[PDB]
Design a protein around this ligand. Structure first.
Ligand SMILES: *C(=O)/C=C/c1ccc(O)cc1
Ligand SMILES: *C(=O)/C=C/c1ccc(O)cc1
Lengths: 125, 125
């Protein structure tokens, strides 16, 4: 495992150094999106929570294709505000329920250090 | 019962001699984790507090699987700091609320004497 806690204040600095395998070592789900919501990275812990295969979702659009239940003011709306403002750091609970048993999670979206990159972190609640 | 008090200054020396049955005799919950948070030992008193079955949780990851509510800077963050520094001795109250009635506890994490081992002690408050 990689010793990083969900919600940590410097998470964007710690995860900037991680390859695919290190991201797969986290205690929580980690998704990286571009500013349009296309999936750039997606770790194994996320697949443990939602059942998706981390290899197959890369390149798909999170809001349009993978996670339409997040296409709402309360999730996508917050994401796109943060993208437009160039700052994003918001945490909230949510339920993931598309083609799956409804699963309540805590979500933390935070702008990455890489250009045009935004993290979506997920854990069970 | 085993005559050891929660928070005692030499608890790591006293619990080094205990088998499963002696650990099960303590007045408080006692979990032993490796440095990644995988569960090595887990006593009966802990199961009385949180409802989990001590045999089934051995080998699971505390922060990723069993106790996601502890995957936070205030619990896991402190744990991993103590692991990285090779010293850990911290006590704090916390609420355990994953798939259970929220239960307020006092937590004491302390490095064990065994290599790559860390105690998490729990009592109700
Ligand atoms: C709602 O449609 C949520 C879908 C979802 C969220 C997170 C994932 O890893 C996969 C699908
Ligand atoms: C939060 O998710 C806490 C969970 C928990 C703590 C302690 C246990 O013995 C079992 C589950």
């Amino acid at each position: 495992m990689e010793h990083v806690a969900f919600g940590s204040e410097d998470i964007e600095n710690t995860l900037a150094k991680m390859d695919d395998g290190q991201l797969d070592g986290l205690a929580f789900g980690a998704i990286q999106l571009d500013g349009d919501g296309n999936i750039l990275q997606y770790n194994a812990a996320e697949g443990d929570i939602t059942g998706r295969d981390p290899k197959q979702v890369i390149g798909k659009n999170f809001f349009k294709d993978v996670a339409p239940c997040t296409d709402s003011p309360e999730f996508y709306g917050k994401f796109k505000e943060g993208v437009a403002s160039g700052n994003l750091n918001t945490m909230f609970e949510y339920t993931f329920d598309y083609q799956m048993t409804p699963t309540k999670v805590k979500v933390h979206m935070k702008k990455a250090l890489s250009g045009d990159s935004y993290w979506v972190f997920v854990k069970r609640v």
